Amino acid sequence: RQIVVGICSMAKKSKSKPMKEILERISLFKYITVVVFEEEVILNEPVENWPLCDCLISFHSKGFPLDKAVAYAKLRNPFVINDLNMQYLIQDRREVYSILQAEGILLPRYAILNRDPNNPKECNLIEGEDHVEVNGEVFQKPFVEKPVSAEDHNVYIYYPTSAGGGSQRLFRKIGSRSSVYSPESNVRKTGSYIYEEFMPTDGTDVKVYTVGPDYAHAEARKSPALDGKVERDSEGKEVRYPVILNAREKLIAWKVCLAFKQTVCGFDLLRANGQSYVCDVNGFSFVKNSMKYYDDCAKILGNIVMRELAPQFHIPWSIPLEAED
Ligand SMILES: O=C(CP(=O)(O)O)O[C@@H]1[C@@H](OP(=O)(O)O)[C@H](OP(=O)(O)O)[C@H](OP(=O)(O)O)[C@H](OP(=O)(O)O)[C@H]1OP(=O)(O)O
Ligand SMILES: Nc1ncnc2c1ncn2[C@@H]1O[C@H](COP(=O)(O)OP(=O)(O)NP(=O)(O)O)[C@@H](O)[C@H]1O
Ligand SMILES: [Mg+2]
Ligand SMILES: [Mg+2]
Ligand SMILES: [Mg+2]
Ligand SMILES: [Mg+2]
Numbered sequence: 001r002q003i004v005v006g007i008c009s010m011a012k013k014s015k016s017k018p019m020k021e022i023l024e025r026i027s028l029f030k031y032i033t034v035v036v037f038e039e040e041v042i043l044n045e046p047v048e049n050w051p052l053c054d055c056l057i058s059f060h061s062k063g064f065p066l067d068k069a070v071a072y073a074k075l076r077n078p079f080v081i082n083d084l085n086m087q088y089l090i091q092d093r094r095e096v097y098s099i100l101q102a103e104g105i106l107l108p109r110y111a112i113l114n115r116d117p118n119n120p121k122e123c124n125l126i127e128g129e130d131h132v133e134v135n136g137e138v139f140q141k142p143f144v145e146k147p148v149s150a151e152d153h154n155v156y157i158y159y160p161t162s163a164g165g166g167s168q169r170l171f172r173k174i175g176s177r178s179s180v181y182s183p184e185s186n187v188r189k190t191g192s193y194i195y196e197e198f199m200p201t202d203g204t205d206v207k208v209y210t211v212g213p214d215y216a217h218a219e220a221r222k223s224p225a226l227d228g229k230v231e232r233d234s235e236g237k238e239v240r241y242p243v244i245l246n247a248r249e250k251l252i253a254w255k256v257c258l259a260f261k262q263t264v265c266g267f268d269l270l271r272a273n274g275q276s277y278v279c280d281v282n283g284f285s286f287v288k289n290s291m292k293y294y295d296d297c298a299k300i301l302g303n304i305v306m307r308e309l310a311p312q313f314h315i316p317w318s319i320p321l322e323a324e325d
Pocket of ligand 2: 108144146150152153154155170196197198199200205223224225268270279280282
């Protein structure tokens with residue numbers, strides 16, 4: 001019989017352009033059949049009624065019932081491409097940074113401010129005009145303040161008096177803007193945050209996309225920390241700049257992929273002071289608008305499936321050579 005690869009995510013993701021491009025290419029594998037789980041089934045049907053698969057590609061986004069995905073995998077024991085339990089941890093920036101540290105991955109110096117919503121003023125925070133003290137640890141402005149929830153994209157940067165003070169408030173892109181300046185110089189007074197040192201870059205962030213530990217595509221975009229106007233080309237797509245990862249960065253990608261057990265994994269790099277710092281790990285994420293990535297990603301994922309399962313299905317398989325870039 002055919003090896004069945006099941007795709008389990010919100011419809012917004014399962015029906016996206018990159019997903020469709022990749023799934024058509026995986027379907028080209030002679031012994032692989034692709035089954036996309038309907039969102040109505042995922043949300044409304046008990047896991048006992050979900051389609052069967054031999055390999056599961058499943059990932060959380062807003063609205064996704066991760067508890068059900070975990071129960072399904074426990075019930076059916078498929079080969080899992082992106083580990084489901086780690087997807088709880090990826091939602092919490094504190095857990096992300098903790099894992100990166102444990103792996104010896106360079107990251108910004110940071111401190112966690114845990115605030116009790118009932119006792120908001122009892123937290124370990126002291127504010128000056130040009131610095132904060134978080135659990136005793138000092139951060140001179142400029143510094144970055146991130147919500148502990150990785151799904152909350154309201155990241156603020158606080159400027160020193162020497163630069164005019166105030167703050168840059170970042171957010172999920174709304175049309176032509178990714179951030180705005182505010183005259184507010186004082187930090188947020190409700191919620192829990194990670195405070196971290198601001199790393200000076202050349203004005204771009206590097207986005208890295210892994211497909212297994214030995215392949216990573218990188219590209220750069222204008223930092224939303226700069227002025228907040230999104231750069232678009234003549235076709236209306238956000239401008240991306242070419243990146244080739246160095247040997248240190250290729251190792252970072254290998255480590256992130258393995259540490260979080262996410263075969264397909266997106267993360268952000270800051271090129272600063274002659275090193276590269278990870279500032280965010282997003283989990284399952286495809287490159288957009290690259291034909292070559294569609295080809296490479298589908299080939300790599302199909303090969304992973306065949307490598308793992310071809311012996312069980314008595315299918316002959318000799319492992320092929322793959323690009324790393
Ligand atoms: O903002 C946009 C609109 P686009 O820029 O015109 O495409 O697209 C973003 C998606 O928002 P929505 O598509 O509107 O839901 C967002 O999904 P979410 O987190 O569920 O909100 C992520 O997509 P993914 O799930 O990781 O693949 C972002 O990629 P990231 O995680 O590396 O930051 C996308 O940003 P990039 O496309 O500019 O790289
Ligand atoms: N320590 C830092 N130093 C300098 N710039 C930073 C730092 N942390 C974050 N940034 C910038 O702020 C942006 C948003 O921060 P990030 O930690 O990626 O938040 P996010 O809400 O998880 N974004 P994403 O998940 O990629 O949509 C990054 O792309 C960087 O440009
Ligand atoms: Mg096929
Ligand atoms: Mg995501
Ligand atoms: Mg990011
Ligand atoms: Mg993120």
